[PDB]
Structures are given as structure tokens and as C-alpha cells.
Design a protein around this ligand. Structure first.
Ligand code: ZN
Ligand code: ZN
Ligand code: ZN
Ligand code: ZN
Ligand code: ZN
Ligand code: ZN
Ligand code: ZN
Ligand code: ZN
Lengths: 241, 242
């Protein structure tokens, strides 16, 4: 089964986010593991990808990134790439699939109401803190007012334990980050949805959706790196039809 | 009443209890003896519920709460500098140390030996049960399985535990005895977790098995149930050497 973002989806845009359900992989990758570098059977991963691309009605294969937990955006201008080293992608080309691979990190999908540009972001805390979302938004020709954002399944505020330094880093950029951390031993529990919403507001994006799942809690629906260590991967996808 | 006392031949030197949703201070949907600190409850209420339970249970120390990940790892409670509390079972041979597991549908299993020198507590979700958490816990004991007692705590029962074909498949890949513990329910099955546990226990030589008569999902006035409620409190099961 496939998560369909609950937002006012514009006419020529289409989106989906995968779960752990309905694949072919064996534990600890059971069953719809999309990740090719976490030690799964390579023929199973290939099979899960095929089923998910069918289930999601993707028009072409996703442009998978070399995700490095940074803040760079690849503009999906053309099929042979000089380097896919990026944690976000941007497209204004019909049929081109933006894709981001996650199991705890925040997926964010963007599109404009006019339905002429899309973006997908893999926003781990470091990339989020350093401004991956602001950098993705800045790629859009449209104005932020016209931009929709969907917050995908990520590790939620009851499970995302971070060190004092992480909380420190977020407040160094934007002091109101403080409300997104709650003390918990020598650490804090952090609300990644709250932090993403703050960055998005600071940049003018007001139509924000999703943010109601937790990859760590919902173990029957999602892989979680923090929970499992060795485990599968989900992905979120957006494209212009 | 905040507490269930396992009904088994409790050895001298051992004590155990398992909590209910009754007798605490938490507000709905955590009403009222919620012990879980990570389900969105008022944490002052959670600490009061814990104080109340620990008092009533006559625990000699605070529980060694695990970071439960629904796997099959057993932490031997050898001494508080631990590299990681990521585990779904614990084992102690140290008087005064409390083994504890936190549940609201998953099977709690408490273990001890007739001599009263070793205890263990297991949070057995279906994934961990399937991958062999009970067998793993049993193999931590120095004593022989014949001298091991096992108590099945309140879990989601065979009329409520609905699973996909894949769960049945997984269990029967380990042992086709497992087919007995499943009954079709549409394109689904209703699974008997107590039956699956009893099969693993027998496989391993544990013959003295008690409890397994409750249903967290049915008894909404005694137990929290994650399947029933989603946002809800947590019970826990505890055992220790006196
Ligand atoms: Zn295969
Ligand atoms: Zn990540
Ligand atoms: Zn959670
Ligand atoms: Zn905690
Ligand atoms: Zn109160
Ligand atoms: Zn559980
Ligand atoms: Zn029915
Ligand atoms: Zn029942």
C-alpha cells in the first residue's frame, strides 16, 4: 500500500510515498525495501522497485541521488549527470521523477499550484539545519506563496532523541527553534516537523501538509534506522505529469 | 488492583507483578496507570503512576527500562555501565535488580527457575517471537529448561490479533506446527500469540507454562491496547530476585 499525500494536488502534478508493505524482501528488509545499499538481496530490491513504480504509476524511473546528508539540490535538467551528489532534486520537466530515499529522515515534497515545478528533499537534521529547504524553495521560479509542501513520514517528536549540540546548532540560525526541543536526560527529544515548518514560514511557504506519522512508532508500516539499525528504505516521489 | 500477581509456583527468592490501567492519575486516553513516558502523556502523571506501581509491587529498586525495538536481543543485567539498552528482553541473576518490559498488546513473558536464582522478562512482539526471542532468553539461563517456569502476560488475544498472510507464512517457515495458531479472517488471519509462544517454549524444553488467559483488546477496563486505541498508555511486567 502507498501513502498518497493529503494536500490539494494541482492538475499536472502527482505524488506518492512508500511503506514497508507489499514487497518481496526478507527480514530485516521485509518487505518493500527500495534501498540498494543496506545489504538486501539485489534481486529483491529490483523487484520492489518495479512493484512500487507500477503501484505509483510513475511515468519513468526515479532519478535516485547520491544522498550525503548535505543541503545541495540537483536540478533535473538532463539524463546523463555530472554528479548526483545531492539531498534534494528540482524538476520543471514533465515525466521526470523527483525521488528521495529515507528511513527516519524527513522527506519533503514541493510543487506549485500552477503545476509546473516540483521538488523532493531528503532533510536529515544537518541538511535541515544548514538550509536544504530554503535552498530548494529558492530553486522555484514561482513565489513561495504559491508553493505547497508535504511533510513525509519521519521519526517523530516522541522518538527523535538528539544531543545538546544539535539543539544548539538550530538555535544559532533561528532562535525560535527552542520550542521544537524538549529536555530528556542529557539529551532532547526533537520535533523535526516543527523545525521544518519554522524554516518554511521564514521563507514564505504557508501551505504545509502531512507531518502526522512516525517511522519509529509505526513499525508495521515503516522501516526506521534508529529502531532497526539494519533495515530497509522507503522513498517519496513527485513528478509533473 | 493496579497489579496482577502471576499465578504460578513462585519460587522462594523471586517476586513478580504485572500492571493494569487502574489506580493511577493519568487522564484519558492514558487513564489512568500509564507507565509509558513516550506516548504523549503528562510526564508528572507518568512519574506518579510509576511511584504508585513500584510501591504497590514492593520493588527493591527502579526497573531497568530497555529501549525496546521489537527485535530479539536480550540484555544481561550485569552492571549499569551498559554499552546499549537496545533490547527486547533482560536477564538477571543479581538480587535486587528488576527485569521489566513495557507492553500494550505485545506478549510479556516472565521467566524464573525453581531454585530462585535467575529471572528474565521478554517483550515478545510477533517479529521478535518469530525470530526467536524466547529461545534466546531461555539460552541465557544457567539452569536447565526443565527447571524453568514461564508466565504469559496480558497480550492481544486470538479473537483480536489480526495479521496478514505474510505473518502466518513467516511463522510456518520456522515451524509448520505454527499453522495451528492461525484461523482465516477474510484475506487475513486471527493469530493466537499464546499458542505460538507455547510452541517455541516446548521446542526448547520449557514445560511449566502459566497465564495466557487475558486479552488486552477485549478487557478495555483493565488494559491499554495499542491496536484498540492507537494513542494510549502502557502496562509493564516485572520480575526480580529478592
Ligand atoms: Zn526471492
Ligand atoms: Zn537521512
Ligand atoms: Zn513516534
Ligand atoms: Zn525517556
Ligand atoms: Zn494531575
Ligand atoms: Zn510491542
Ligand atoms: Zn471479523
Ligand atoms: Zn480478546
Amino acid at each position: 500500500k502507498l501513502i498518497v499525500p493529503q494536500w490539494p494536488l494541482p492538475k499536472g502534478v502527482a505524488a506518492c510515498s512508500s511503506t514497508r508493505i507489499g514487497g518481496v524482501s526478507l527480514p530485516p528488509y521485509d518487505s518493500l525495501n527500495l534501498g540498494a545499499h543496506c545489504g538486501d538481496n539485489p534481486d529483491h530490491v529490483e523487484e520492489n522497485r518495479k512493484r512500487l513504480f507500477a503501484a505509483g504509476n510513475l511515468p519513468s524511473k526515479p532519478v535516485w541521488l547520491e544522498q550525503v546528508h548535505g543541503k545541495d539540490v540537483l536540478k533535473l535538467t538532463g539524463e546523463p549527470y555530472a554528479s548526483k551528489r545531492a539531498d534534494a532534486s528540482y524538476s520543471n520537466t514533465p515525466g521526470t521523477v523527483c525521488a528521495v530515499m529515507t528511513a527516519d529522515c524527513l522527506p519533503v515534497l514541493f510543487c506549485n499550484r500552477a503545476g509546473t515545478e516540483v521538488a523532493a528533499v531528503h532533510a536529515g537534521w544537518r541538511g535541515l539545519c544548514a538550509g536544504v529547504l530554503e535552498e530548494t524553495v529558492s530553486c522555484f521560479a514561482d513565489k513561495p506563496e504559491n508553493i505547497l509542501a508535504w511533510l513525509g513520514p519521519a521519526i517523530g517528536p516522541r522518538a527523535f532523541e538528539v544531543g545538546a549540540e544539535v539543539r544548539e546548532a538550530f538555535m544559532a540560525v533561528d532562535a525560535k527553534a527552542s520550542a521544537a526541543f524538549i529536555q530528556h536526560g542529557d539529551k532532547y527529544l526533537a520535533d523535526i516537523y516543527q523545525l521544518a515548518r519554522q524554516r518554511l514560514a521564514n521563507v514564505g511557504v504557508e501551505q504545509i501538509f502531512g507531518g502526522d506519522r512516525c517511522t519509529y512508532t509505526e513499525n508495521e508500516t515503516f522501516f526506521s534506522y534508529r529502531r532497526d539499525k539494519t533495515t530497509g528504505r522507503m522513498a517519496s516521489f513527485i513528478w509533473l505529469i
